[PDB]
Point group: D2
Chain length 509, copies 4
């Protein structure tokens, strides 16, 4: 019955996966919690099983992780980069089979499953050089005979909670950066992508053990809300990096603040594309389509709100409808497929609720809107017109492939409409107007963490920091100086002079 027991999926064994897999790694493999079976969202068939972490597994893992940190924090950062460099190579050696697992267990198409593994590889190669660069300035002290230096040190144990939709890359950004910064890591991925978490951890565990390093440096405790909540409340998790929904992320943020911990929050987006009258429409339509239906609309950066100037609204909507009609739906591993299943059956149900609610709020479905009658969690990519920019279903957002299209007339109102939602991840304008572009980049422009021009809302590379504002949580991952979130700053004054302080009337000896 299990896909891994069928000969056509024998490649799963290339990742060291078997029928039932240990979901706890801390130098040793184990798992005394509930045994979870994950299913292929393309056909609802069970893949294989993972033994999740019990409470005792978590406790023992946190303790071993903190013990491992004593060794890890003493290793010079450039030599930690060498370990990350070898992780990058180990992922490279398995990039095809690992991407296939992503397409199989998570459900995105092969080029994106592979693309996600590549993203992890790239942040490793980036981190190798960064491991020779992290630090702070020596500043000129105002005091004679004094040195003033800014030092950066690891926070210690970095808990990393990741979500289903990017079950490799998000962890990889957190892991590569946290590691070169001298932290040990504890990963709790999404339960429905447990095999992916196990397969990644198996790849990292081999690198650590080959270098005779304690495996708890990159610990794994598979589990659900119970393990994630424990991490949020655990004073031993110095930094908790959380990627997931705003609702859960809000509670995580509060629990970490309650104990004066650090949180790095990467939550939802309600991302807008704005097409102005002067836009290259041959650029708008494909950019809008791919940003909306890519990954079955399940990216944090998915385009969910399409603002079109009134003069070109009907043309762009008509051109999208005809282009939507050609989206090729199928099994995500089939090479010609552009559009795969939603991750869960619950997501299918939420999609239907959103479509029907959008109809109740006055919207018109001009394309899609129905569940597809076929095995798996397939729904039609959908376009909804006629809603006001402030319609409730547009503000709350769903994680469904539904593109809400709005009209606008002038720049000032649509910048505000971009900014009026609670989320603040990504944003894009399509225009040729030089001044409009820089106003968009300015203080009266987009309020998001990613502010794009003539590229859709999913345009981001590892060189920059990734994250958003407002209800997106404020955290940043990957590039620029995002590494400082994984370290603690100290401002250090060293008196190296023989100067004694002024006595101020006091007679010392």
């Amino acid at each position: 019955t299990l896909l891994i027991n069928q000969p056509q999926y024998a490649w799963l064994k290339e990742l060291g996966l078997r029928e039932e897999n240990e979901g706890v790694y801390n130098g040793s493999w184990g798992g005394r919690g509930e045994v979870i079976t994950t299913y292929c969202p393309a056909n609802n068939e069970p893949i294989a099983r993972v033994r999740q972490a019990s409470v005792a597994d978590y406790e023992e893992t946190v303790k071993k992780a903190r013990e491992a940190w004593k060794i890890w924090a003493d290793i010079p950062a450039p030599k930690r980069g060498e370990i990350v460099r070898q992780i990058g190579d180990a992922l490279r050696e398995k990039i095809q089979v690992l991407g296939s697992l992503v397409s199989l267990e998570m459900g995105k198409i092969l080029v994106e499953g592979v693309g996600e593994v590549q993203e992890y590889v790239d942040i490793c190669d980036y981190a190798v050089g960064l491991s020779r660069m992290i630090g702070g300035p020596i500043l000129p002290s105002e005091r004679s005979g004094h040195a003033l230096i800014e030092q950066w040190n690891p926070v210690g144990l970095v808990g990393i909670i990741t979500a289903f939709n990017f079950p490799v890359a998000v962890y990889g950004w957190n892991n590569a950066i946290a590691m070169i910064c001298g932290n040990v890591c504890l990963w709790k991925g999404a339960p429905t992508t447990s095999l992916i978490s196990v397969a990644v951890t198996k790849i990292i565990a081999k690198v650590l053990e080959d270098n005779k390093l304690p495996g708890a440096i990159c610990s794994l405790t598979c589990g659900g809300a119970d393990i994630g909540t424990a991490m949020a409340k655990d004073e031993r998790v110095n930094l908790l990096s959380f990627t997931g929904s705003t609702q859960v992320g809000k509670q995580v943020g509060l629990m970490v603040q309650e104990r004066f911990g650090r949180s790095l929050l990467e939550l939802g987006g309600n991302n807008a594309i704005i097409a102005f009258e002067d836009a290259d429409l041959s650029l708008v339509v494909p950019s809008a389509l791919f940003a909306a239906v890519g990954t079955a609309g399940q990216r944090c950066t998915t385009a969910r709100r399409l603002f079109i100037h009134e003069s070109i609204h009907d043309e762009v909507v008509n051109r999208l409808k005809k282009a939507y009609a050609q989206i090729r739906v199928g099994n995500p591993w089939d090479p010609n497929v552009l559009y795969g299943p939603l991750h869960t059956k619950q997501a299918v149900s939420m999609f239907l609720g959103a479509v029907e609610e959008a109809k109740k709020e006055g919207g018109t479905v001009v394309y899609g809107g129905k569940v597809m009658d076929r095995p798996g969690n397939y729904v039609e990519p959908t376009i909804v017109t006629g809603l006001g920019h402030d319609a409730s279903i547009a503000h709350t957002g769903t994680f469904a492939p539904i593109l809400y299209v709005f009209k606008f007339k002038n720049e000032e109102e649509v910048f505000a409409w971009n900014n009026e939602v609670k989320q603040g991840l990504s944003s894009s304008i399509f225009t040729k107007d030089l001044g409009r572009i820089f106003r968009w980049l300015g203080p009266k422009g987009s309020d998001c963490g990613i502010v794009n021009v003539n590229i859709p809302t999913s345009g981001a590379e590892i060189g920059g920091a990734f994250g958003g504002e407002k209800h997106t949580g404020g955290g940043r991952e990957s590039g620029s100086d995002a590494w400082k979130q994984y370290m603690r700053r100290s401002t250090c004054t060293i008196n190296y002079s023989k100067d004694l302080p002024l006595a101020q009337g006091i007679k010392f000896q």
Copy 2:
């Protein structure tokens, strides 16, 4: 009866103070809230009155500040720096009379009151140059025909809540930095330093008004917990900088997190000096004394825990006793005075409670411990020996001039003893050992935000970032890249090429 009506305090009128003063400024002065009288702690006499903010005052002020932000955010940062430079000069012209007000209403000695105003002047002079430098890198994009830029923009309204012990400088750090970053400010100072808040605001308002700028750029709403709590809950307050107690800061931090706002928390310290056997005692003893008794022990960075190696414990304590007996006590504006009153009568009672509590935990008062027989809130600077480092009064502690002395033997235990308290603001070792110094600065060393060598726990200048870790709250002020907390980062990809996305098998028009 009011000091401002007595001819010997006529200099107060040089700050624009009157018998009853308006405690709300938003371009206009007002205040419909409760009228508070503030008192001089050196003689327990009332100084003058301040009309605090009502709820309606607060509402009107927030609205005016946000309206003013539209004007202020359009002013180029270098020109915002010119405004800050002129504030620097306006404070210069008033440094003596303003510092005298700090001594009178707060109670610290004159050189420290003047010194606090100098810090505001210095951070202004720093911000002038910074206003031509703030921003992010242009990064090399991996995509041909694309630019990748990291932009920084103001968050909007920066609420600034400050405490009694530094009623000028903490505001000044936030104000100077937030202003050049294009933010408007809302100040709620400690109720018992209301005259200081008003006088500072009077100086800034003239500069703003002299430059034909809306005064709400630097708003003031005098008030207590009710106004501060409103700021913590106010979604219109984009950044809340809070300086105060750990108990309050924790609730403030939770409230800001509840609404996905930004907070900058500068909370309590329980700071330690560690003297190793090789230390220069002619440097340890004065450094310990001045760091312990300065500001009557009411600094966030006041030295509260003195660890002395067993070989020199008795000698260092004996040398401290002889030096403490020579501390000159008096009115804080008297120039010969090194030691002034505690800020309130309640603090005197708490001082007595702490001394009595230290005796209950097994401690020995080797110097001081009693209230002084004189008008005002004067208590003897006190030294306590014999407690274990894990004694309850040592780990929590009060805001009293009580120095707890401990013995230690080896380096690792005393580093851990430094780190074992909940707070993490400042820390100092005195030693000549080169390796011990770098280990202190390293990952197994001090866990504090300020990590000093051969200078006590109050060694800090504006060039570096100021703040602590753990229950100190994690915020940073003043130097390095602390300005990024007052701005929002965006990662911006600009497609300037004529290239189109790949069709991926779809026919576009």
Copy 3:
């Protein structure tokens, strides 16, 4: 006969100038060299006299500056910034009378003379904050128990040779930055602006003396080529900043390279404005005029080559002619005057030589070309059309107010024509095309040190580094990290561990 003895120029005495002035300052004032009389180019009247430096004056000044450096380099950089802050204020208090001297002795119009002093004022305020920021990173060593830090220290004595056309700002840029970096300075200005050099030095000398500092920190030795050549060959001159002609700068660079000194070269520019077809002509025409005729065409960044697309060439040229006809010529201090005299009588002769040579080389003078029949060195601002882009008089380029206008058709040829001259200082395109704008800024765009869009060739502020490439010499002044040219970098590894090296088979003791 001297202007300083006439009552209408009595304001000169406000700068401490007299009939005959000492041109050597090294803590004391002197001058045993040749006495020079400087003349007002607006009427050819002599202004006053300056006693220049003899060899012995130079020898003594260098020795005292190097002695003073021992004191100056021990002063903390933020405290050096405080001195630079006071210099800015001392310049502020005299901005009007000093800017007037620039107009009288050099000949540019009053708002530009005043503006030049403001440039020095602004760089001082910038350097104040910079003096708390200069330094390098603490890097993570690959070796255990080692620290790796990059240190910056002053080079020592910075010789600053400046030119007539910016007789205040160029020195100021060098001075304020070299000073906060811990260097002493030796200034030799253009002989024909000796009074300006003396007047500036008097303002600085007062600030140094008021702060109880050796005056030689900002030394002055007025002189011509003989002193400049001595500075270029002087091993005691650690950095030579030379601003002037390409011909002279080339010999200075070679002499400094011969002795392994450091040089900072700010040489000629042959700057082009390029107007594309989609450009706002209501922006092109005023911008071109002001950048070409401003300062009577005697700026390093003066627009000398105007490339106009063939479609709009005749319209732009005709609008340029009609606009030149409204330029108001007069005494440079007289209000509403836009156009003053050339600096010298030789410059008039070179203007005439260039005009006739352009005619012989196939050019047509469509406006101006003649000396004006009036007192002073006034020549008509001139427009020459019809030359090929590679005309010899266009490539060499005099310092005369002649604007050479060319046609172009496509982007690639006109970028190449911008880059085809030996100089590489300033450059501008006027266009609305987003892609052209970024191609102009990229590796196939402008090759100059200043690359502007929709603003002329004189657009430059202190926040950025100022200087050019190719025959402009490569130096940078003012903003960004130009300060590193005034300091020496050291890469410092500190072994703080007790770890002994690997014995590698040797029996050590």
Copy 4:
């Protein structure tokens, strides 16, 4: 007779080396110049031959390299980093045989031959991340509606001349950095390491060819002074990096300055180790030996001057003598060998002349001083005592393993003695004194480019910039922001507003 034709050296063929090799690579292999035979300095046996570049070869190669630059500069820097990463892997794969070739042709021992290749590997891995970081800041303009950006673009063609002693690493440092910065390279190695140059170039060429890139991006023209001189005078060589003698580097710098090109000069060192009385002798003695005799004393960073405090001079010298006697001499590829031959017989004659001159100048040879009676260019590592610190042979300095030992008493004089030589590369103090250490790093300390503490003069890693001051030439390679020497800075102002310049009275259309 040629070593490559003997079967024991068949491993040379693994690098693509044959009996006669092409010494020109520009996408094709050739060489019409004189054929040079290189010899093994351990036995003076011929290895193989290399056909060097004629003038026509050089011309053709520069032209193809400049054509290739048009393709190379358009490739996004991260993608250039991907090429550099593969060069690193390709070096990894050949590290043993290439290290053996370095030991065979140059004469250093195998671990250092492998170590030199490893250094190139490391700079590649460093440059991979750096290729996502190079760039400049976005600055806040003082003009509303304007952007201010600092751009960095390649210089174009980077000429790289390297020396015999580091025939891989120096090229690799320049190559990896120049490539990610968008430049093409032209390499002319030392004639006596021609096989190494060819072998390295073969490794790079395969990577470029596999990636369908023009091979002239990493061009090679083997030759001596004539080709090196051609590069120095060639306006087509935008940056000439020269590593070699001070005498030649001085002429190269002058030739480049004459044509207003860029040079990066890495010339000789005359480096000092200073042992204070408080130094750990168990650390001084091995450190001095390895820094003095490593690479048979042929590094730029070789310890040539050992200053010992009077109190410990005799003990250190005696401990140095006992350790020198254990230095194991042999063929540089022979296992466990610490000490190989000098590179040439001429170096042996210079060694002998220096020893006799040092004795004639009053020095005593306490160990070594003689040619070894065996095949190859073997001389005894030598220690000379009794000379004054300013003895003539100590200031000039050969490239021979002769360690000059001097006495000192006080810190200030021996600091001055470190600084008194013309060169200024590396320097080290061995001490435990905290204040002395910071004074050594400060403005009155070492004047060298590398300023070390308790680690000898060869302590340098790629994370920092490498190079010296004074007669060492001032260039920096490898770490920090050394990449900026391989790029040109532009300060770019973009007016994105519709604002027009002030009419200044002129009526425009």
